[PDB]
Amino acid sequence: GEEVRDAYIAQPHNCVYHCFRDSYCNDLCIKHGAESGECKWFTSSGNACWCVKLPKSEPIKVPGKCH
């Protein structure tokens, strides 16, 4: 049945959803089907978008190389 998990969302073009502010990722996550979203500064490689209870159906950061 229903199944979700908190993971770092990433665009379908193999990359981290570049959000200008928490307000962006927050609503951006809702469209995908998440409870909420917040920006987290992991490094100086650009702010990423963190989604909550994000559904597997949606894309997620994967090991490789961002364009």
- What's the rounded Cα separation, in Å, for the pair 53 and 62? 17
Domain boundaries, the chain: 1-67
Rounded alpha-carbon distances, angstroms, from residue 29 to 44, 50, 65: 22, 8, 23
- Expressed in angstroms, the distance from the first to the final Cα of the chain is 35
Taking only Cα atoms into account, the Rg of the chain, rounded to an integer number of angstroms, comes to 11
- Please, which experimental method was used? NMR
What is the distance between the alpha carbons of residues 19 and 4, in angstroms, rounded to a whole number?
Answer: 22
Distances (CA, A) of 48 to 3, 33, 43: 23, 18, 9
CATH of 1-67, one of 3.30.30.10, 1.10.8.60, 3.40.50.10680, 3.40.50.920: 3.30.30.10
